[PDB]
Design a protein around this ligand. Sequence first.
Ligand SMILES: CCCCCCCCCCCCOP(=O)([O-])OCC[N+](C)(C)C
Ligand SMILES: CCCCCCCCCCCCOP(=O)([O-])OCC[N+](C)(C)C
Ligand SMILES: CCCCCCCCCCCCOP(=O)([O-])OCC[N+](C)(C)C
Ligand SMILES: CCCCCCCCCCCCOP(=O)([O-])OCC[N+](C)(C)C
Ligand SMILES: CCCCCCCCCCCCOP(=O)([O-])OCC[N+](C)(C)C
Ligand SMILES: CCCCCCCCCCCCOP(=O)([O-])OCC[N+](C)(C)C
Ligand SMILES: CCCCCCCCCCCCOP(=O)([O-])OCC[N+](C)(C)C
Ligand SMILES: CCCCCCCCCCCCOP(=O)([O-])OCC[N+](C)(C)C
Ligand SMILES: CCCCCCCCCCCCOP(=O)([O-])OCC[N+](C)(C)C
Ligand SMILES: CCCCCCCCCCCCOP(=O)([O-])OCC[N+](C)(C)C
Ligand SMILES: CCCCCCCCCCCCOP(=O)([O-])OCC[N+](C)(C)C
Ligand SMILES: CCCCCCCCCCCCOP(=O)([O-])OCC[N+](C)(C)C
Ligand SMILES: CCCCCCCCCCCCOP(=O)([O-])OCC[N+](C)(C)C
Length: 24
Amino acid sequence: VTXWSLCXPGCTXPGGGXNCXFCX
Ligand SMILES: CCCCCCCCCCCCOP(=O)([O-])OCC[N+](C)(C)C
Ligand SMILES: CCCCCCCCCCCCOP(=O)([O-])OCC[N+](C)(C)C
Ligand SMILES: CCCCCCCCCCCCOP(=O)([O-])OCC[N+](C)(C)C
Ligand SMILES: CCCCCCCCCCCCOP(=O)([O-])OCC[N+](C)(C)C
Ligand SMILES: CCCCCCCCCCCCOP(=O)([O-])OCC[N+](C)(C)C
Ligand SMILES: CCCCCCCCCCCCOP(=O)([O-])OCC[N+](C)(C)C
Ligand SMILES: CCCCCCCCCCCCOP(=O)([O-])OCC[N+](C)(C)C
Ligand SMILES: CCCCCCCCCCCCOP(=O)([O-])OCC[N+](C)(C)C
Ligand SMILES: CCCCCCCCCCCCOP(=O)([O-])OCC[N+](C)(C)C
Ligand SMILES: CCCCCCCCCCCCOP(=O)([O-])OCC[N+](C)(C)C
Ligand SMILES: CCCCCCCCCCCCOP(=O)([O-])OCC[N+](C)(C)C
Ligand SMILES: CCCCCCCCCCCCOP(=O)([O-])OCC[N+](C)(C)C
Ligand SMILES: CCCCCCCCCCCCOP(=O)([O-])OCC[N+](C)(C)C
């Protein structure tokens, strides 16, 4: 899976509210 940046970025997380790893 190698992470680094594949562990979300592009997978959506707008920031309104929170609870999605980017915010969470
Ligand atoms: C800038 C682009 C960078 C690309 C880097 C190369 C990615 C090649 C595709 C890898 C797909 C499979 O991945 P994975 O089985 O979860 O990991 C590899 C795990 N082992 C080493 C133990 C087999
Ligand atoms: C590039 C480095 C990261 C690789 C991480 C791999 C983790 C193991 C994935 C195992 C599941 C294999 O199904 P996939 O092909 O993913 O399912 C997508 C198939 N369609 C396109 C037809 C919908
Ligand atoms: C019309 C063109 C069709 C041919 C090109 C598309 C081939 C199908 C996709 C190739 C595999 C891409 O796996 P990935 O996103 O690195 O794995 C993500 C793994 N998880 C879902 C578990 C996070
Ligand atoms: C002729 C065909 C050539 C194909 C070349 C494919 C290269 C894929 C490389 C994927 C590397 C995945 O990251 P890693 O293993 O943790 O980094 C290793 C970094 N060093 C080598 C400096 C230790
Ligand atoms: C043209 C742009 C050149 C940028 C050069 C920046 C300095 C790089 C120093 C080398 C160490 C850092 O990078 P790396 O762990 O090998 O890469 C993956 C980095 N991320 C985890 C954030 C995705
Ligand atoms: C298929 C034809 C093209 C083959 C090209 C083969 C040579 C590729 C050399 C690539 C040199 C890149 O630097 P590095 O130290 O390994 O970065 C390591 C970066 N990670 C920590 C994110 C894994
Ligand atoms: C403008 C878009 C061009 C697309 C074509 C090129 C795609 C491949 C990018 C590969 C570079 C990604 O560098 P990184 O792993 O973050 O740093 C690695 C830094 N060192 C080499 C010093 C270890
Ligand atoms: C070019 C055509 C695109 C069409 C897309 C249609 C929806 C397919 C949904 C596929 C869901 C599984 O993949 P995923 O874990 O989200 O993908 C890899 C993303 N990350 C590296 C950030 C984990
Ligand atoms: C597509 C139209 C052109 C847009 C140009 C925007 C430039 C934004 C520059 C601000 C930094 C963006 O940092 P990031 O992407 O999160 O990290 C990339 C990290 N390295 C540079 C080391 C690879
Ligand atoms: C894997 C595909 C993900 C597509 C996500 C599109 C969201 C709408 C962006 C519209 C503005 C142009 O785009 P960008 O801000 O330069 O790129 C997206 C950068 N993030 C992934 C960090 C948000
Ligand atoms: C084989 C030729 C190369 C094809 C490459 C296609 C790339 C499609 C990118 C779709 C948008 C993905 O979101 P992004 O913000 O740009 O993701 C990088 C995440 N950081 C900004 C944090 C570094
Ligand atoms: C050498 C030529 C390189 C060409 C590189 C092309 C990169 C194209 C990246 C396209 C990323 C598309 O993801 P997205 O916006 O979320 O669409 C999927 C939207 N639905 C789930 C609603 C269907
Ligand atoms: C002709 C040789 C190939 C050229 C390169 C084409 C690169 C196309 C990249 C397409 C990337 C598609 O986004 P993804 O994250 O996997 O979508 C999964 C669903 N979300 C966007 C919602 C997370």
